[PDB]
Design an enzyme around this catalytic site. Sequence first.
Site, PDB file in Angstrom:
ATOM      1  N   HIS C  16      35.670   6.345   4.045  1.00 42.97           N
ATOM      2  CA  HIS C  16      35.510   5.620   5.306  1.00 42.97           C
ATOM      3  C   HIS C  16      34.437   6.076   6.292  1.00 42.97           C
ATOM      4  O   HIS C  16      33.950   5.270   7.071  1.00 42.97           O
ATOM      5  CB  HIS C  16      36.848   5.508   6.049  1.00 42.97           C
ATOM      6  CG  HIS C  16      37.357   6.802   6.601  1.00 42.97           C
ATOM      7  ND1 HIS C  16      38.225   7.616   5.908  1.00 42.97           N
ATOM      8  CD2 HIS C  16      37.129   7.417   7.785  1.00 42.97           C
ATOM      9  CE1 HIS C  16      38.514   8.678   6.644  1.00 42.97           C
ATOM     10  NE2 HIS C  16      37.860   8.579   7.786  1.00 42.97           N
ATOM     11  N   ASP C  38      40.542   6.290  -0.507  1.00 44.97           N
ATOM     12  CA  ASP C  38      39.542   6.689   0.471  1.00 44.97           C
ATOM     13  C   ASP C  38      38.932   8.028   0.102  1.00 44.97           C
ATOM     14  O   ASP C  38      39.173   9.037   0.761  1.00 44.97           O
ATOM     15  CB  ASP C  38      40.197   6.752   1.853  1.00 44.97           C
ATOM     16  CG  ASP C  38      39.204   6.980   2.980  1.00 44.97           C
ATOM     17  OD1 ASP C  38      37.990   6.742   2.792  1.00 44.97           O
ATOM     18  OD2 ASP C  38      39.663   7.380   4.073  1.00 44.97           O
ATOM     19  N   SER C  96      39.550  13.108  13.056  1.00 43.29           N
ATOM     20  CA  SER C  96      38.455  13.563  12.198  1.00 43.29           C
ATOM     21  C   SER C  96      38.534  15.054  11.907  1.00 43.29           C
ATOM     22  O   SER C  96      37.537  15.765  12.033  1.00 43.29           O
ATOM     23  CB  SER C  96      37.103  13.258  12.845  1.00 43.29           C
ATOM     24  OG  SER C  96      36.913  11.868  13.013  1.00 43.29           O
TER      25      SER C  96
END
Lengths: 335, 36, 140
Positions: C16, C38, C96
């Site tokens: 992503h 992902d 993140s």
Amino acid sequence: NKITPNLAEFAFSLYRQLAHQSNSTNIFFSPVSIATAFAMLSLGTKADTHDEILEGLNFNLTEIPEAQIHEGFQELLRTLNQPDSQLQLTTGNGLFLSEGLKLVDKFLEDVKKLYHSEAFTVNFGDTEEAKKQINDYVEKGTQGKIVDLVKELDRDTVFALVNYIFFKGKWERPFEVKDTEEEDFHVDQVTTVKVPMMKRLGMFNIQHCKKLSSWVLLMKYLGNATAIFFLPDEGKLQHLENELTHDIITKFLENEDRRSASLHLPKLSITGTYDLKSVLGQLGITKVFSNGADLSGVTEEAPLKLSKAVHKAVLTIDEKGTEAAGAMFLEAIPM
Amino acid sequence: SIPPEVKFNKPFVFLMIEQNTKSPLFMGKVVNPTQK
Amino acid sequence: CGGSLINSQWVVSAAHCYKSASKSIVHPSYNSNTLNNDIMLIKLKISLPTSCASAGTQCLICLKAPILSDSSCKSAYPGQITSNMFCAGYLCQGDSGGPVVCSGKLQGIVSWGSGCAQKPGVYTKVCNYVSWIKQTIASN
């Protein structure tokens, strides 16, 4: 002169969400403001984060070509900023970029041409100072009506999208201050407050539409704008809120049918403040807020996503006319 | 009565519209003019 | 975001963070809407796992975090958890964060995000892609 029916339906959709959220609080927002901030952002957005946004603004993507939606906003904004000399109406769009951040050139030129957007550079590293800039931009833009748009600015903020709308009009038929008495206002079955009620005996564009179970009053301003008020009959507020459509409003706006009446309209000073993330999520706009977001159309340097969506609006109604301002703050950060 | 007496003394909805474009500049609902 | 070297030339990260070194190879079945699969490989110019971590197992990221059960996970982020994901945290870091390394072995990579210490994180089970990973490195 179009895409308007979508904006109208967007106004009602968002309204129903804010109403469902709370039925005991005043509500004041600006559709044009929220809609253009998101429309402008879809410019640098790709795939489905893109479609959710535009469909979240009530656009049928298979019926109206994407280029034409943006041409619609471009023309809408141009018209709004050229009012009759008697009416004051302005709007502004602004991109706040951080030093460095190489933006995709097409995105920058599009917000510039299609949304007449301004663009600034700032160091979000100095939060208090960057926050100061954005807030002054909005304050000067709304002529002091909105001074604290951004209360919290993230340190990792890569870019911010901001816009404002300012309005000031005089009633075509003003009220007389000396006729303003203080009367009751029935908030609900248990509460009654006293407020300054404006009064005028005369001729009005007013009528009782049984389709909405409520009286409908239209008061023109000098220039190109009108105020519409809906007074639901006993226990009919929910009915009125659900029966409103763009077609119905369109009908009222074409006939100047007048008649004699004794009107009692209160002065006002209300404000609306919102965190549109959840309410917008309920309207299908969720991807642009998650890691599944695609803002690769804005920049390729980093993978960005929307962190906040704040809206603020203030209103003032007195016997001379109306004064209103709205503002939108969109903050983006790296995943 | 005659003329009709219309009083906005209970919750009501309102819309601020620009005439040329016919677009909705502002929308709101007044529940308590003094809420604050 | 941040990758993770599994050998001298190849770093493995989430799919992503890239496009909405020398080469990128996103997983062929990567679903950009559900973030299922992902994961991706980057060739330039920790170690792959041999077993799937289980509830309770240790792990780290600075700040240690335990593997929650699928039950908890599935019902804390309802409708968002595929069979190739697991939770790691409690009951900040901010969407993140770094990988979940359980005993020197790369067990997980951030997909939907690293939750907050103040009331979990969601990762991709690297354990489920070792075969595709070795095969891709061996032939590239």
